[PDB]
Amino acid sequence: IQLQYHSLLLIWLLTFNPVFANELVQKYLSDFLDLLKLVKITIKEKVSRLCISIILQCCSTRVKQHKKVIKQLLLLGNALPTVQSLSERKYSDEELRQDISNLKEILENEYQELTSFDEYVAELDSKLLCWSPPHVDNGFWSDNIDEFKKDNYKIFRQLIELLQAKVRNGDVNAKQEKIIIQVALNDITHVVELLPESIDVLDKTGGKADIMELLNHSDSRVKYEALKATQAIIGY
Amino acid sequence: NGIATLLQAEKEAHEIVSKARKYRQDKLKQAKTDAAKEIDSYKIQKDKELKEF
């Protein structure tokens, strides 16, 4: 605990300089998420305050690309939900509570400009999908069908590439990998049902072959998702 | 699936039949040319009557 507190203090001191904070922001994209997880797990007021200060320094306006860094942190590490949970929780330290409130306000301001489309784009870029609310939201798919097919179906091509990578990674058949594969299959089925023009692009890019390969997967959920995608493709 | 692929082939055959429907319309377009020729033939008969007068 003492070593972790000293490391957090050193990180905050380094991040006090905007140039060093900006350099360390790109050094580890998951550093903010790890710091937030450590702050949530740790009950020490000093450690939580140091973690909050370190997180705020990375997203501070002094550091370069402060808005971009804050948006990326909120999209990847779920900074807004963690900050909202911390605000609801009661902290004995007044300085730690003030830092948590400031971080929550910054996260809310960053998320106000952002939308579900930005979160979906970040998830696609990170190649991580765990059945997000947008995947199960019919309205989101209906209002984002044109965006998916935009730029010569760039989003559809990215989804097809992610599905192909998951099929290549399907040998491991990990739980997270299986969930990602199922989410990708659901997204492909939605993009085939709506905007049918994307079906030809998916077939050209080997999406049908990937679905057929996933139909023989050992996992029951993956097989069911592949069967549903095949039914949406040419089936009833 | 294999059954779905066979169904797609039936749909493709229907799509070919849908293309053949245009060919059937194209086949019926030959009668349209004859019908258009018949329209001109009626005018030719009327013109011949006018020419005779």
UniProtKB/Swiss-Prot annotation, chain A:
Q: Which residues of the full protein are shown?
A: 240 to 475 of 478
Mutant phenotype after disruption:
Increases the ATPase activity of membrane-detached V-ATPase V1. Abolishes growth at pH 7.5 and in the presence of calcium chloride, abrogates growth at pH 5.0.
Other notes: Present with 22500 molecules/cell in log phase SD medium.
What is the protein's name according to its record? V-type proton ATPase subunit H
Indicate the family of this protein: Belongs to the V-ATPase H subunit family.
Subunit structure of this entry?
Answer: V-ATPase is a heteromultimeric enzyme composed of a peripheral catalytic V1 complex (components A to H) attached to an integral membrane V0 proton pore complex (components: a, c, c', c'', d, e, f and VOA1). Interacts with YND1.
Q: What function does the entry list?
A: Subunit of the V1 complex of vacuolar(H+)-ATPase (V-ATPase), a multisubunit enzyme composed of a peripheral complex (V1) that hydrolyzes ATP and a membrane integral complex (V0) that translocates protons. V-ATPase is responsible for acidifying and maintaining the pH of intracellular compartments. This subunit is essential for activity, but not assembly, of the enzyme complex. This subunit is also required for silencing the ATPase activity of V-ATPase when V1 is detached from V0.
The entry's localization annotation reads: Vacuole membrane
Q: From what organism does this protein derive?
A: Saccharomyces cerevisiae (strain ATCC 204508 / S288c)
The observed outcome of changing residue 171 to A is:
Appears to have no effect on the ATPase activity of membrane-detached V-ATPase V1 or on cell population growth
